[PDB]
Amino acid sequence: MPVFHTRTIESILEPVAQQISHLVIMHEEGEVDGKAIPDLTAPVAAVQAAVSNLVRVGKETVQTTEDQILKRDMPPAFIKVENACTKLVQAAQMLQSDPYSVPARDYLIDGSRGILSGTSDLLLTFDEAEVRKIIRVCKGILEYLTVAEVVETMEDLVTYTKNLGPGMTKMAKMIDERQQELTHQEHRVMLVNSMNTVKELLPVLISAMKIFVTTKNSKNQGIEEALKNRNFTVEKMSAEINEIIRVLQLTSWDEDAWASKDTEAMKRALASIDSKLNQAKGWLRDPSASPGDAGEQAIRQILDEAGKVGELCAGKERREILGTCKMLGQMTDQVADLRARGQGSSPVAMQKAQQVSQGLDVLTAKVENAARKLEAMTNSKQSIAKKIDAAQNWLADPEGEEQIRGALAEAAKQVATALQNLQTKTNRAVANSRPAKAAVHLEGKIEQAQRWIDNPTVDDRGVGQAAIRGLVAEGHRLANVMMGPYRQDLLAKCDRVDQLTAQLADLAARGEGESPQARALASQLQDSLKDLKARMQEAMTQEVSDVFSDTTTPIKLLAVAATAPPDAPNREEVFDERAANFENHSGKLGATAEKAAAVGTANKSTVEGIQASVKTARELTPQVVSAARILLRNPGNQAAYEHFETMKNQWIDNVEKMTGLVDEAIDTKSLLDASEEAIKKDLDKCKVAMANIQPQMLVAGATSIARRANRILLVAKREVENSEDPKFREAVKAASDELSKTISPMVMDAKAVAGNISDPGLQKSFLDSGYRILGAVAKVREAFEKDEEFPEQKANQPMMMAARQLHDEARKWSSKGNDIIAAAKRMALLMAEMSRLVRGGSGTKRALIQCAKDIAKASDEVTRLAKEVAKQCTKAAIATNLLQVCERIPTISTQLKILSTVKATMLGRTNISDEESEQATEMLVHNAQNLMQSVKETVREAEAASIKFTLRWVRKTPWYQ
Ligand SMILES: [Ca+2]
């Protein structure tokens, strides 16, 4: 099994597999055509030289290495390489006498496959031991984080610190280089993110240890919260280091990453369900609470936490959570409706809601069954495969209950091969046990839903249905905040899409699927999705413009409620309230940011970033509250002040970058319409505030207006650092500068009217300044041959389904006139050929290798011209994003060439294929999908970068809506 996770392996294994492609090409020229095989002497000598380098440095390594694992795993590579090497040399010797020798060609096709396998295994052992070093350092730091609790003296604090130094420095350097030596870009992203999180967590660590030790040397009263924050820091840092250790051992795409994410989100739904369980169960059972209240929604969103669990369990276990969720949802609806009319406390208002909520305690129990279930499934999954199967697979050459412990929790060297077979079987069952998941960014969800609604191939891609369900769930989440327009976007559109999709499902499983009765209804559902996208982005924009207007005043009031004088009144009466409003504000911001990441127009990178910052703030709120409680506890103490300032600054910066990333995910002109609407509404509350003599309300509204104007100044300065032309830098700046001109006059005029609230001239001055701000924001807004067909042939196909998904996606646009759609069409066609060639095996070797070479060539065309597109385009975000989709193309093309050469050395269906040939088909399929859809995203985003010269993206199909 070949590997490609580093640039050194690739730089070594690409020319090797290339010369091997030559040798198997001449092998086919010999075996299929009976042609003279020429002087293999020079090429075999070059191969055996470039490989004898690896063998030589390896043999020198095993002498001077203290690594025992290397001493075990390295000589077998020496044998697997030397054998095939000498075998190829022998083939070169025999084919000098008789260039038609039938056993000399047996030794030519066995050695090339053997030199590929052996070379890959040898490099894999090197790499493996190189990482084992890095993991040795990481485990060093992990063990050093456990001795953090023994520090009780400032002497122990400084000593602990200075000794922690060198290991941290060495780890950071090692990871910074290893990530630069990796080919899988996502792995690099994970290493960078984790190491950055640890490095950003060190100062918080020494701060928490500092307040712990100052609180310990003296007899201060903040000892508990201090150890809470310190133990939390050890927890988070140790967890991130463990993430580093897991990623470092990855040699392919993420295979078991879904497990940990699914189980941690699974537990997150419950850790979040606890609090709202208590609160909502406590203050709903009251005889009335006006609907739309935050305490009312406190149940309506609880069920949402169950839904995200129901979307994680497989399609069958969805039963309990889905049916219970629907019944609880409709019975609470009746609670709100009945309680908000002339009749409350008719037993239907008590006896129904009571049995229901007593059932809320039941669906809160059903979700833990699936949560415990799945985990035991992941802990058993990794415990069997990793801890016993590998460890005693190595030690096959005694003691027993390792293979017993693996064999019990599941349900010579060929016996271990059977162990690998059954392991793959268990991984198959585990993989099926979980349902397919829709994308997270919007266009992925609506694209999968789109691919299911128009041609529902019966009983596959429940990913489209899952995308519709995730979109409808996100529409329910966006709706709970509204009031009047609450019913029109929720009831009509969300339930209309749920109903319509239920019609296209019941109308496809129990009946016919291709009739126009299901295709005339499909357009009824295809545009409804567009409606939910439009109004969902609209309501999301309105919600963001309100919730994210002020992100810092609650924690500011909490900061001044902590430094209150000791003789101040109601110190905890106001403090606990500031912490309550601070936790509520933080959670509200987090939820709004989640909706923004789900519905907004932003690439998956910024979606993962928004979710990451929401995770971080959600983790940071309680420790900020506890820091406020160790400052409020000890007045005049400098250490508590430094700690609370550190924590509060952490929260401030995380919510700041959260505000920015969330702002990226919104159509900025729609945002300007939203904030302009908010300035219109704010001024009405000002006229009213004057009419009823409310100067505090007036200055509050004016400060809100100036706040929004400054925010618009931020989003306007953002468009300056994004455009590379003063076409935008005098239009945007020429308006934002005047918007900055209009700010302060409105403020001082507001302060003027606040003292004489009924003076018509003063009021007139203030209002004039305000509407001048309004017009300024308005100006800021105003500143903004022929073709081929797919060779589908009648009856492997999973490799062709990707080729179809690219061909059907490339043909949507221009035939020619742009080399990228020509090259992508040709790539999907050549992939339709390669799918036919993989299960071939009769003169298909040269056609398959030549096919991979063609795919790599067209890939170079796409990458080249797309890189040309990126540098003649405004807004650097689209350019850099396009480059991000472009860099993952040449790597996957090269890996496609090498894998193709392996499959070619095993393509003459001469038998060495217990499952070894089945592996190379699967790797070619995985690589084929990743390449395929990678150039698909490169095509779509390539057109996005062409709306900004260069290409012509005119569409093919004639306009018919
Ligand atoms: Ca003035």
Side-chain angles (χ1 to χ4, degrees), residues 474-533:
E474 214 66 44
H476 276 258
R477 278 175 272 187
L478 274 172
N480 292 0
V481 186
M482 300 181 297
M483 298 173 298
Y486 165 50
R487 304 179 301 265
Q488 57 181 187
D489 177 51
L490 176 74
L491 279 306
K493 269 189 267 293
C494 288
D495 311 359
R496 169 169 153 80
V497 166
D498 280 353
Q499 283 169 355
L500 261 55
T501 314
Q503 308 226 15
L504 193 45
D506 211 358
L507 184 59
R510 289 77 198 171
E512 310 166 338
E514 195 64 20
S515 61
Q517 299 246 322
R519 303 176 68 179
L521 195 64
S523 67
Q524 199 163 348
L525 180 57
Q526 180 182 330
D527 282 51
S528 306
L529 281 174
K530 313 291 178 53
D531 302 358
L532 274 72
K533 180 171 70 69

Side-chain angles (χ1 to χ4, degrees), residues 151-158 206-220 223 226 230 639:
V151 169
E152 298 161 340
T153 306
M154 197 75 59
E155 207 176 27
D156 308 338
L157 180 54
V158 56
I206 192 183
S207 175
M209 295 182 65
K210 177 129 59 181
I211 56 165
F212 178 81
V213 61
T214 59
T215 311
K216 200 64 204 68
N217 275 329
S218 60
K219 299 299 185 301
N220 294 326
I223 181 61
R230 187 201 62 177

Side-chain angles (χ1 to χ4, degrees), residues 605-658:
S605 66
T606 59
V607 177
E608 306 145 351
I610 289 178
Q611 298 172 186
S613 69
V614 173
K615 175 202 183 192
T616 300
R618 169 248 302 177
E619 292 169 347
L620 256 180
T621 305
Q623 292 74 349
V624 172
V625 176
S626 298
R629 263 195 195 278
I630 60 101
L631 191 155
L632 176 88
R633 186 66 63 183
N634 299 269
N637 181 266
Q638 183 176 325
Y641 184 79
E642 309 279 17
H643 176 71
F644 173 72
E645 287 298 316
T646 303
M647 302 294 303
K648 100 157 190 177
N649 282 340
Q650 296 281 308
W651 199 90
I652 287 302
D653 65 60
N654 193 85
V655 179
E656 219 72 66
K657 66 170 298 183
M658 180 163 131

